[PDB]
Amino acid sequence: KKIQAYIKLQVKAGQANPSPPVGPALGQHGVNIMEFCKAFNAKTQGQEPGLPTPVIITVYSDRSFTFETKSTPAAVLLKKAAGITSGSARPNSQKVGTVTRAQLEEIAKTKQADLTAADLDAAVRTIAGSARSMGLNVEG
Amino acid sequence: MIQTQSMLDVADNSGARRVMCIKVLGGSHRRYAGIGDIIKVTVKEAIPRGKVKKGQVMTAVVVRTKHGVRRTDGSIIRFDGNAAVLLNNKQEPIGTRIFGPVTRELRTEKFMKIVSLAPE
Amino acid sequence: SRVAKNPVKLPAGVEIKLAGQQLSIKGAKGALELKVHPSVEVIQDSGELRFAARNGDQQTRAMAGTTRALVNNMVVGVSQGFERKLQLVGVGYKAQAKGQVLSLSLGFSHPVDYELPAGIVAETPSQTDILIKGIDKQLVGQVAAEIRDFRPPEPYKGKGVRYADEVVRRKEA
Amino acid sequence: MKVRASVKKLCRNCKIIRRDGIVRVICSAEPRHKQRQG
RNA sequence: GGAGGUUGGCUUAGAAGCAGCCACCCUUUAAAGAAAGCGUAAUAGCUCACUAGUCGAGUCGGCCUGCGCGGAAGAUGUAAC
RNA sequence: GAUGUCGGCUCAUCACAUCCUGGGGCUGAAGCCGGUCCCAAGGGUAUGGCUGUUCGCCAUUUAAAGUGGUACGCGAGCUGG
Ligand SMILES: [Mg+2]
Ligand SMILES: [Mg+2]
Ligand SMILES: [Mg+2]
Ligand SMILES: [Mg+2]
Ligand SMILES: [Mg+2]
Ligand SMILES: [Mg+2]
Ligand SMILES: [Mg+2]
């Protein structure tokens, strides 16, 4: 039916109801936002709740929506790695003080190193490819 | 009246005394205008106080002429004098009381006003 | 590869009244199809068929490919019912078939009364569907096009007759 | 149509056909790429 | 299938692979460019880049070159063999 | 050892690079209107005020008041500003 990944959905972990982080984002997809809250309730307390949580969703049509088990998000918690909230006005050339490799340790402890990587070191290398996002280099 | 620059008076109370034809409306070049047609007048000689000022482009319908109106018979009505009735921007008249007779040939749907207001 | 080398492999009940110049396929579910071949062709006779040109030009190289798809379409027509699914989109639209008459409601002032040719018999399972059955592609496709060109579709509403190609133009401001 | 003297493709979907001796361009994505003569 | 992070950023319901300036790295994986590209400019979708089957012989582009084709509309009558 | 020069009247004829009517494609074309470009020369294509004027500027129309060639059409046809 609707079979391709990279479907963009950032609402709160445990609460699908706050829309203006994405708004009307899954109307043409087929399944409305208010039914996904049972799936965001299944993955709480580790995927950075409170802030709206991005997750690669796999849209089905049989009342089942699995979320890929990425424990710590590397789209929003790498804003926290440098120590800011609002990123730079251009990524990786405009800077507010870039993030180094010494501050990529607390996020990388709980990576679930098979369910998003092969070993744990490439999951540290995942956020070496995920901190290149928001006005931040990966330097050392 | 029946040609450009034809002096003809008005049959109306609030109007002027005399007007003059400047353009026969209708087709490409209508050269003549019979009874029941729209012309465009200039006001040439007003009453010392009515409603219409002297020298103003207005619009009128033709109601009496010396050439006559002809019916589906060999029977024609032929007056002596030409006569017009002024209109507004929309085709309703300006005045209240119409002077003299009119004909019943004029009465169409848009002209049920002035037929009722005149002593035929 | 080339379609002129793949054979035909005709099914069970098929007559070939081949006079050399004029072939004729007869079968069940309709019959009487025949085509007059352009002359520079080799036509063999077997359980299958193979076509071959003689003068290796830029034309007979294309003649043998055209005549292979034409013979193949005569085989399927006495084997499978050709069909075209036309749908109606819009309020106040309907189609009311009366035997050999297909009369329509398209929001016009006078109702169109389209008359079908012999052969093709059309059927309407709904008020917004047409099913056009026949034996040849070119005659079924021609009648289905001429019904469509009464009221072609619209990018703003879709309010017009359309067949099953769901790649219709849309724009909306 | 759009009569030119230099027809050419614009997107990936344009195919250049020479129909009845004239170099046409038909586009199956956008109608604004239809070009007639060149 | 068409990627693992992932809304990649300030941004804007939406800027995400498809405001702006841009990131273009690294990896679950047989496979995947944080993306070519229309798609709701935008959310899909479907493609592209990719790999599995399926199919079982050629295919793709550039260079030089002979003859041609569009570009090519006027006043009394075909009317620059 | 002579080809009578500008505007008006009368009468016209061809071109198409189309002003109107006829057929269509695209649109930042909802509908009414339009914009732009291909095809089409069959019939149509204003009365006045001011100036020697063509031109123009105005007033009022109309489906529309097209652009050029024909000794800048036409004095052994008229006028003579
Ligand atoms: Mg043709
Ligand atoms: Mg031409
Ligand atoms: Mg001499
Ligand atoms: Mg033309
Ligand atoms: Mg002259
Ligand atoms: Mg003389
Ligand atoms: Mg002379």
mmCIF file of C-alpha atoms (C1' of nucleotides) in Angstrom, chain B residues 4-5 22-29 40 57, chain F residues 45-49 59-65:
data_model
loop_
_atom_site.group_PDB
_atom_site.id
_atom_site.type_symbol
_atom_site.label_atom_id
_atom_site.label_comp_id
_atom_site.label_asym_id
_atom_site.label_seq_id
_atom_site.Cartn_x
_atom_site.Cartn_y
_atom_site.Cartn_z
ATOM 1 C CA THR B 4 -28.673 63.377 -35.857
ATOM 2 C CA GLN B 5 -29.219 67.076 -35.112
ATOM 3 C CA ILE B 22 -26.778 63.556 -31.404
ATOM 4 C CA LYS B 23 -26.554 59.759 -31.850
ATOM 5 C CA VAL B 24 -29.006 57.062 -32.904
ATOM 6 C CA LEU B 25 -28.230 53.995 -30.806
ATOM 7 C CA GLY B 26 -28.750 50.475 -32.050
ATOM 8 C CA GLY B 27 -26.742 48.978 -34.891
ATOM 9 C CA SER B 28 -23.732 49.943 -36.958
ATOM 10 C CA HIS B 29 -25.145 53.082 -38.550
ATOM 11 C CA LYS B 40 -29.041 60.079 -27.053
ATOM 12 C CA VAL B 57 -25.690 64.271 -22.204
ATOM 13 C "C1'" U F 45 -14.529 46.960 -41.459
ATOM 14 C "C1'" A F 46 -18.516 54.465 -37.799
ATOM 15 C "C1'" U F 47 -20.872 59.364 -37.670
ATOM 16 C "C1'" G F 48 -18.853 64.357 -35.748
ATOM 17 C "C1'" G F 49 -15.831 68.742 -33.357
ATOM 18 C "C1'" A F 59 -17.190 63.616 -27.763
ATOM 19 C "C1'" U F 60 -20.368 59.554 -28.757
ATOM 20 C "C1'" U F 61 -20.992 54.611 -30.850
ATOM 21 C "C1'" U F 62 -20.095 49.348 -32.575
ATOM 22 C "C1'" A F 63 -19.573 42.366 -33.431
ATOM 23 C "C1'" A F 64 -15.146 45.382 -35.221
ATOM 24 C "C1'" A F 65 -14.004 50.819 -36.303
#
